[PDB]
Amino acid sequence: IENARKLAEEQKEQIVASARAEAERVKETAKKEIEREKEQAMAALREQVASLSVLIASKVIXXXXXXXXXXXXXXXXX
Amino acid sequence: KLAEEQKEQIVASARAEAERVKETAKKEIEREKEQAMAALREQVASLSVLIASKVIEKELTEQDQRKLIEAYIKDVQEV
Amino acid sequence: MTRGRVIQVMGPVVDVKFENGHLPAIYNALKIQHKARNENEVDIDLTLEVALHLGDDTVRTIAMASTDGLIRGMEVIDTGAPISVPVGEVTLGRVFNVLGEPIDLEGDIPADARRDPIHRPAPKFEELATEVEILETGIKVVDLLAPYIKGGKIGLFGGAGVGKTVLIQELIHNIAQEHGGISVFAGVGERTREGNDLYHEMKDSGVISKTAMVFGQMNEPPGARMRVALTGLTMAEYFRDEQGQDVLLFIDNIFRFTQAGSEVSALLGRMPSAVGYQPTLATEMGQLQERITSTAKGSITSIQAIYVPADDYTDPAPATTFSHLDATTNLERKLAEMGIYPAVDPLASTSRALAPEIVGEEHYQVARKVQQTLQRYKELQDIIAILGMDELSDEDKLVVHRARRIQFFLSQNFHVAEQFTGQPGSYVPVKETVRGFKEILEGKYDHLPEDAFRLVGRIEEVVEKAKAMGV
Amino acid sequence: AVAYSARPLTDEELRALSDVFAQKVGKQTLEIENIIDPELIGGVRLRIGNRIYDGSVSGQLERIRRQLKQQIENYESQIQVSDVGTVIQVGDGIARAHGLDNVMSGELVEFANGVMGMALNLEENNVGIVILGPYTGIKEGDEVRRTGRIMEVPVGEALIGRVVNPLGQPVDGLGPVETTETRPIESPAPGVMDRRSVHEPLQTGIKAIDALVPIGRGQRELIIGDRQTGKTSVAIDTIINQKDQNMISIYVAIGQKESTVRTVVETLRKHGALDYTIVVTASASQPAPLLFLAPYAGVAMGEYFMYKGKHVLVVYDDLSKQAAAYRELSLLLRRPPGREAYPGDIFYLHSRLLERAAKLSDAKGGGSLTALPFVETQAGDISAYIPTNVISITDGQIFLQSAINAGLSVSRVGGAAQIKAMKKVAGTLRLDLAAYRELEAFAQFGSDLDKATQAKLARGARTVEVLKQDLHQPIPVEKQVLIIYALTRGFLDDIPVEDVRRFEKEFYLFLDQNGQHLLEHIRTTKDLPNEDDLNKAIEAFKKTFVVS
Ligand SMILES: Nc1ncnc2c1ncn2[C@@H]1O[C@H](COP(=O)(O)OP(=O)(O)O)[C@@H](O)[C@H]1O
Ligand SMILES: [Mg+2]
Ligand SMILES: [Mg+2]
């Protein structure tokens, strides 16, 4: 009885450890994927943010002003 | 009999705990993704604010003076 | 066309500024009625009672409800009189607020009914009537050692959770039907579920249609808990002084009135007295308690329950209220912890009607002997505690033997306590109580076990209970 | 009357604006003292009296405020106005400000730092403010503005399974809470003609409470004892036991240690009790103003469910720490102290809170709200100030001994809040417990007749061994009543007192195996099953039992 309970507890603990380790591995893969997506979206949505910034300034207040604003944003980033 | 039933109960409880841990990890990943999207939006908003400020500074204020006077009169009427 | 303005708001206390030579008198009632002007405002419907004149056309008033939402600058209206309350036959069988508005959702009292002011002076020396008659309650420890008067003031002192409410309900059940007159119940600073239970119990029993109720309870601001006893007092005074009737008056806890006064006086700007109380404790207590009297027209029998903070009987409030009572009843936690119910202390409870010419000659001797044996037993507690019962003389052992039996026979089973224990409840007339204690003092029942005396009505029931116990 | 503008405005425009504002405000004439502040390049910001009209630069910052088509093309910018004041005093957690003309009593104000406060006293030329947060960022000369709302908390079903602080800000780090409703912290209680008597049981799962001190839905019961008597364990077991019952639980921790709060939340999450629980926390390092609003925030969160027809249960982990925080706050305002230095309205502070628990009538919906306040004593003194203050508010008490003390623990409403099956068997158990309790007082060393030697001692010892329990293992009412019925009917009298716990465990196993009809009859009828069948089952178990 005690031996069977100990075996069941050991198997349960091993299963829990395996599940936690698999979750950690999935978390590492998800973190890497999220970082790569964050960088790519940072570039793309930074271009989009420059365009939307030109649009927002115009709304609060064409192509040449947008190009000048893009150059200014690039200079600020640099 | 009873010992095997207790073993099965322990196994079921461990399985439920593992499933809860898996759900918590999935929710943590979703929360991380949501926070990353929010941070990207915040960075985009800050860049938009900076670029809009620069553009508005570059814009001519000769008509902006009259626009500000008109907006002040409108706000006076509204309030 | 005379208006005030709010100047300060500090909790339950407000300050109002008026025009020159247009100030309201003390105790007047003022009204605020405000409708929101924008989204940063709420709606206000409030009444205030004038308390002080501070100079510079400013008065300081006490609020009857919550002051949240008040804005410095809102205008106030002077009614021209104190709080006025409806009186007469229109208030019999109804439940009321502090301001006199019904809260039982059965309709609205017409605006043309006669109304009386809350504040008035006491009756003078040339109008009271002095005489002592005895009121029967059916309680052994009350009938024997501290009988009630038929036209006086009765007090029930108690700590927390010792049995004030159960005793109040038992007395209501026994007396209010036998009275056959009018009764008023005022509840100040008590549990709301208790009032909800009592209303339905009265409606089932049928004591309603000759009762009026007023409720200001635990959740209300201090200004409301201060001036609720005065509303029931006015309602009873109408009957006494206009129809020459005999009126009963119950007050659920008279301590809350002084406690609310103490809470207000701090914000009114007064230097505190001992234990932090207000300087005007005795004056307010006397101003309330001197209107509850029996004049030449009618009488007002008032039964009041008084709370004792931290089980300290020397606190300023119980000590001050002790002086207005004709019969008192003190409940102790030590007796309740032993299972004795009710927990009346047989030596500290007094009555002015315990005289040989009022109750009789046998009653007086029986009560005095019982008290003497209880005091003698009380004197021997320490030496029994340390040494034991083996180092006593024969007379002392006899004293203890009879004292335990007497102390257990002072308990009883009540009608309203049936839902707790199960016993139906008992009622004992005076003569039976005197007879039973006379037999106990004579050593007639010295052989029965001491446990057969607990929670019975009469002494024949003691004999039956001993018989069923195998002896 | 001072304007901030990017460029010096023309005198004619200044005159026109001054005349317009003179006409609007209500003054015959007005003069503006324009400034040359160049930071505000968007437009003009006016400050007259204690009112401000914003320019256009703030709109860009308002753009960040509109973080949230494409923001409706930056949405639209409007001239937002606000009423302001300035601080003139700050220290020990209480401020004091000028301005704020049209402020209300009990309103919420916001400091320039970001912290919030209450408007407490509106004096002639002053406002007293209580700071709900860290006060080391507020200095004299700072700016404070109104919000236009009486104090309130966010309420809804989005709060279920979250840990928040008395203002509704999450502290577990799982993200924002998406609610859409609010409720005022100070609200009136249900009236006399809105309630009804309590007639439903609340099952804690503990035999001693469920049999001797029953609790009903809509009651107010007090749990009182010394420190190190373990009342948090009672609270956690009661909260865990409500898994099947349709109940919503709220746990409020006042003045506790944040580490123990962390471990309690971990214990709750293990047993799956976070699907119906809200946790409100204010630890020992937080300001006294925050330690004093937590019970009111909890009750405000509970009343949202209560006034919809649902049933709620609220736990206040210590009222004796709320009392000390309120005494500290009121002594800093220089108010005359009373007994034990407590203020005069320390009774009102607790009576106004515990009177919001009620069993509503059927015209109001039929909801309920149960309350379980905690009070901690010193050396078991039940006649102190605060313990007697709270004993006179509730409907009973449960005194834990440093093990329920049945000589001081009582329940008024309970008794009608019990099922018939337990009501039939509780009386005998109470009498046996009393018999042992008084017998042992003198019979420690003394011979007795066989009656008092066995029937008055062995039965009591067996019932005292039965009443014990273990942590985080609540018991269903059917099993509870079956074991109590067996003990009161007379079995176990030939079982050694060292084997009763194992007897009970094996009896539960036998029941779960081959007592389905008994259990279903109890669960469906709320009455005892047939006595002959019960005796037959108990005899079969006794025959199969291996007495050691
Ligand atoms: N006459 C009585 N007989 C039996 N029990 C009583 C009696 N009076 C009070 N009790 C006990 O006291 C409890 C109620 O106390 P209560 O009267 O409400 O306290 P308070 O003094 O605050 O009104 C009940 O649970 C009951 O067990
Ligand atoms: Mg009372
Ligand atoms: Mg605790």
Ligand 1 pocket, mutate which of C156, C166, C340 (most atoms under 8 A from CB): C166
The tokens of D60 are what? 């860009």
Among C323, C358, C393, where does a domain finish? C358
Q: Which atom of ligand 1 is nearest to the CA of C342?
A: 1
Give the residue carrying structure tokens 């709420």.
C42
Residues after which chain A has a gap (C–N > 2.5 Å): 61
Which phi and psi angles does C82 have, rounded to 5°? -70, -175
Q: C169 and C44: one domain?
A: no
Q: Is D415 left (phi over 0), alpha (psi -120 to 50) or beta?
A: left
Neighbours of B42 (CB within 10 A): 12
Burial class (CB within 10 angstroms; exposed 0-12, middle 13-18, buried 19+) of B77 = exposed
Please indicate whether residue C420, judged by its CB atom, sits closer than 6 Å to ligand 1: yes
Question: In this structure, are residues D7 and B65 in contact, taking their beta carbons and an 8 Å threshold?
Answer: yes
**Nearest protein Cα to ligand 1, atom 20:** C161
Beta bridge partners of C331: C344
Q: C405 and C454: one domain?
A: yes
* Contact flag D105-C191 (C-beta cutoff 8 Å): no
Closest residue on chain D to C259 (Cα): D344
Q: Which residues contact D23 (CB under 8 A, 6 or more apart)?
A: none
Q: C295 and C175: one domain?
A: yes
- Helices D319-332 and D346-354: crossing angle in degrees, nearest 10, is 140
For chain B, positions 22-61, list CB contacts with chain A under 8 A: 22, 25, 28-29, 32-33, 36, 40, 43-45, 47-52, 54-56, 58-59
Q: Which CATH number goes with the domain that contains C298?
A: 3.40.50.300
Q: Residue D92's closest CA among D142, D143, D138?
A: D138
**Type of residue at C419:** Q
Beta bridge partners of D104: C71
Question: In this structure, are residues C205 and C176 in contact, taking their beta carbons and an 8 Å threshold?
Answer: no
Burial class (CB within 10 angstroms; exposed 0-12, middle 13-18, buried 19+) of C143 = buried
Burial class (CB within 10 angstroms; exposed 0-12, middle 13-18, buried 19+) of A40 = exposed
Helix, strand, coil percent values for chain C (each to nearest 5) = 35, 20, 45
Q: How far is the CA of D258 from the centre of ligand 3 (A)?
A: 13
Q: What's the half-sphere exposure (Cβ side, CA atoms, 13 Å) at D203?
A: 18
Burial class (CB within 10 angstroms; exposed 0-12, middle 13-18, buried 19+) of C197 = middle
* CA–CA gap between residue C113 and residue C146 (Å, rounded): 43
Q: C353 and C363: one domain?
A: no
The tokens of C189 are what? 């600073």
Beta bridge partners of D370: D313
Closest residue on chain D to A51 (Cα): D70
**Type of residue at D315:** V
Which phi and psi angles does D298 have, rounded to 5°? -65, -45
3-class DSSP state of C346: coil
- DSSP labels for D178-235? ---EEEESS-PPP-GGGB-----B---S-HHHHHHS--BTT-B-EEEEETTS-HHHHH
Tell me how far CA of residue D129 lies from CA of B43, C10, D89, D105, D166, in angstroms: 36, 12, 10, 11, 18
Neighbours of C71 (CB within 10 A): 20
- DSSP labels for C229-290? HHHHHHHHHHHHHHH--EEEEEES-THHHHHHHHHHHHHHT----GGG--TTHHHHHHHHHT
Q: Which residues contact D197 (CB under 8 A, 6 or more apart)?
A: C196, C197, D359, D416
The verdict on whether residue C466 carries a ligand-binding annotation is no
End-to-end Cα spacing for chain C = 86
Which range of residues forms the domain containing residue C395? Answer: 359-469
End-to-end Cα spacing for chain B = 82
Q: C353 and C387: one domain?
A: no
Q: Which atom of ligand 1 is nearest to the CA of D391?
A: 22
> Which ligand is located closest to the Cα atom of residue D232?
3
Q: Which atom of ligand 1 is nearest to the CA of C158?
A: 21
The tokens of D374 are what? 């905690």
* CA–CA gap between residue C462 and residue C446 (Å, rounded): 12
Question: In this structure, are residues C46 and C223 in contact, taking their beta carbons and an 8 Å threshold?
Answer: no
Tell me how far CA of residue C131 lies from CA of C134, C142, C146, C249, in angstroms: 10, 20, 17, 19
The tokens of C18 are what? 């008026």
The 3-class secondary structure across B27-72, one letter per residue, is: HHHHHHHHHHHHHHHHHHHHHHHHHHHHHHHHCCCHHHHHHHHHHH
* CA–CA gap between residue C412 and residue C143 (Å, rounded): 13
For chain D, positions 160-189, list CB contacts with chain B under 8 A: 174-175
* CA–CA gap between residue C450 and residue D17 (Å, rounded): 98
Q: C249 and C322: one domain?
A: yes
Question: In this structure, are residues D289 and D187 in contact, taking their beta carbons and an 8 Å threshold?
Answer: no
Q: How far is the CA of C344 from the centre of ligand 1 (A)?
A: 12
Helix, strand, coil percent values for chain D (each to nearest 5) = 40, 20, 40
* CA–CA gap between residue C350 and residue C352 (Å, rounded): 7
Question: In this structure, are residues C326 and C154 in contact, taking their beta carbons and an 8 Å threshold?
Answer: yes
* Contact flag C272-D383 (C-beta cutoff 8 Å): no
Among C358, C376, C392, where does a domain finish? C358
Which phi and psi angles does C69 have, rounded to 5°? 105, -10
Tell me how far CA of residue D242 lies from CA of B9, C270, D395, in angstroms: 21, 51, 22
Q: Residue C342: is the preceding peptide bond cis (ω within 30°)?
A: yes
D1 contacts on B by Cβ (under 8 Å) = none
Burial class (CB within 10 angstroms; exposed 0-12, middle 13-18, buried 19+) of D223 = buried
Give the residue carrying structure tokens 């469910």.
D305
Beta bridge partners of C213: C95, C185
* CA–CA gap between residue B48 and residue A70 (Å, rounded): 11
Q: C78 and C122: one domain?
A: no
Tell me how far CA of residue A6 lies from CA of A12, B4, D505, in angstroms: 10, 12, 20
A37 contacts on B by Cβ (under 8 Å) = 36
Look at chain C and report how many structural domains it folds into. Answer: 3
Please indicate whether residue C189, judged by its CB atom, sits closer than 6 Å to ligand 1: no
Q: Which residues contact B50 (CB under 8 A, 6 or more apart)?
A: A53, A73, A76
**Nearest protein Cα to ligand 1, atom 25:** D412
* CA–CA gap between residue B75 and residue D204 (Å, rounded): 62
Q: C73 and C147: one domain?
A: no
> Which ligand is located closest to the Cα atom of residue D377?
3
Q: Residue C275's closest CA among D30, D330, D341, B3?
A: D341
End-to-end Cα spacing for chain A = 71
The tokens of D99 are what? 């301005």
Pairing of strands C5-10, D116-123: antiparallel
Which phi and psi angles does D163 have, rounded to 5°? -110, 125
B29, B50, B56 ranked by CB distance to A76: nearest: B50
Q: What's the half-sphere exposure (Cβ side, CA atoms, 13 Å) at C303?
A: 23
Question: In this structure, are residues D472 and D236 in contact, taking their beta carbons and an 8 Å threshold?
Answer: yes
User: Dihedral (C-alpha) C14, C19, C25, C30: value to the nearest 10 degrees?
Assistant: -50
Q: C368 and C273: one domain?
A: no
The tokens of C23 are what? 């100030």
* CA–CA gap between residue C356 and residue C362 (Å, rounded): 8
Question: In this structure, are residues D151 and D118 in contact, taking their beta carbons and an 8 Å threshold?
Answer: yes
Give the residue carrying structure tokens 């410095």.
C72
- DSSP labels for C86-136? E-SSTTTTEEE-SSS-B-SSS----TTS-EEES--PPP-TTTB-----EE-
Q: What's the half-sphere exposure (Cβ side, CA atoms, 13 Å) at C252?
A: 22
Which phi and psi angles does C436 have, rounded to 5°? -65, -45
**Type of residue at D375:** V
**Nearest protein Cα to ligand 1, atom 24:** D412
The tokens of A57 are what? 């300034």
- DSSP labels for D417-456? SS-HHHHHHHHHHHHHHHHHHHHHHHTTS----HIIIIIT
Give the residue carrying structure tokens 């037959």.
D536
What b/e string do you get for D248-282 counting C-beta neighbours within 10 Å, with b at 16 or more?
Answer: bbbbbbbbbeeeebeebbebbeeeebbebbbbbbb
Q: Which residues contact D490 (CB under 8 A, 6 or more apart)?
A: none
The 3-class secondary structure across C360-413, one letter per residue, is: CCHHHHHHHHHHHHHHHHHHCHHHHHHCCHHHCCHHHHHHHHHHHHHHHHCCCC
D13, D56, D67 ranked by CB distance to B69: nearest: D13
H or E stretch including D45? strand D45-48
Q: Which residues contact C392 (CB under 8 A, 6 or more apart)?
A: C380, C383, C384, C400
* CA–CA gap between residue C8 and residue C268 (Å, rounded): 12
Give the residue carrying structure tokens 């973190």.
A31
End-to-end Cα spacing for chain D = 95
Beta bridge partners of D145: D84, D110
Which phi and psi angles does D321 have, rounded to 5°? -95, -35
* Contact flag B44-A46 (C-beta cutoff 8 Å): yes
Q: Which CATH number goes with the domain that contains C66?
A: 2.40.10.170
Question: In this structure, are residues D358 and D218 in contact, taking their beta carbons and an 8 Å threshold?
Answer: yes
The tokens of D508 are what? 């539960």
Kindly tell me the sign of the dihedral angle through the C-alpha atoms of B49, B54, B55, B56: positive
Q: How far is the CA of D252 from the centre of ligand 3 (A)?
A: 11
Q: Which residues contact D160 (CB under 8 A, 6 or more apart)?
A: D248, D275, D276, D277, D278
Which phi and psi angles does C287 have, rounded to 5°? -65, -35
Q: C261 and C128: one domain?
A: yes
- DSSP labels for A3-60? HHHHHHHHHHHHHHHHHHHHHHHHHHHHHHHHHHHHHHHHHHHHHHHHHHHHHHHHHH
Q: How far is the CA of D353 from the centre of ligand 1 (A)?
A: 23
D46, D64, D269 ranked by CB distance to B45: nearest: D64
* Contact flag D20-B31 (C-beta cutoff 8 Å): no
The tokens of D341 are what? 């230095």
H or E stretch including D84? strand D81-91
Please indicate whether residue C436, judged by its CB atom, sits closer than 6 Å to ligand 1: no
Pairing of strands D51-53, D45-48: antiparallel
**Type of residue at C249:** L
Question: In this structure, are residues C457 and C412 in contact, taking their beta carbons and an 8 Å threshold?
Answer: yes
Question: In this structure, are residues B53 and A55 in contact, taking their beta carbons and an 8 Å threshold?
Answer: no
Q: Which residues contact D306 (CB under 8 A, 6 or more apart)?
A: D312, D360, D367, D368, D369
* CA–CA gap between residue D369 and residue D194 (Å, rounded): 14
Q: Which residues contact D536 (CB under 8 A, 6 or more apart)?
A: none
3-class DSSP state of C441: helix
Neighbours of C103 (CB within 10 A): 15
Which phi and psi angles does D490 have, rounded to 5°? 140, -10
Which phi and psi angles does D95 have, rounded to 5°? -105, -175
H or E stretch including C196? helix C192-205
Q: Is D205 left (phi over 0), alpha (psi -120 to 50) or beta?
A: left
Question: In this structure, are residues D77 and D56 in contact, taking their beta carbons and an 8 Å threshold?
Answer: yes
3-class DSSP state of D459: helix
Query: Is chain C adjacent to chain B, meaning 3+ CB pairs within 8 angstroms?
Result: no
Q: Residue C215's closest CA among C182, C184, C261, C237?
A: C184
* CA–CA gap between residue C293 and residue D477 (Å, rounded): 57
Q: Which CATH number goes with the domain that contains C396?
A: 1.10.1140.10
Structure determination method: cryo-EM
Burial class (CB within 10 angstroms; exposed 0-12, middle 13-18, buried 19+) of C178 = exposed
Interface contact D525, partner A, CB < 8 A: no
Pairing of strands D311-316, D368-377: parallel
Please indicate whether residue D402, judged by its CB atom, sits closer than 6 Å to ligand 1: no
Q: C176 and C218: one domain?
A: yes
- DSSP labels for D86-104? EEEEEETTEEEES--TTPB
Q: C389 and C348: one domain?
A: no
Kindly tell me the sign of the dihedral angle through the C-alpha atoms of D443, D449, D455, D459: positive
* CA–CA gap between residue D316 and residue A20 (Å, rounded): 36
* CA–CA gap between residue B2 and residue C123 (Å, rounded): 85
Which phi and psi angles does D365 have, rounded to 5°? 130, -35
Among C53, C84, C115, where does a domain finish? C84
Give the residue carrying structure tokens 């976070």.
D274
Tell me how far CA of residue A62 lies from CA of A54, A58, A69, B64, D73, in angstroms: 9, 9, 11, 19, 16
* CA–CA gap between residue C416 and residue C439 (Å, rounded): 29
* CA–CA gap between residue C382 and residue C386 (Å, rounded): 6
**Type of residue at D252:** V
Question: In this structure, are residues D290 and D116 in contact, taking their beta carbons and an 8 Å threshold?
Answer: no
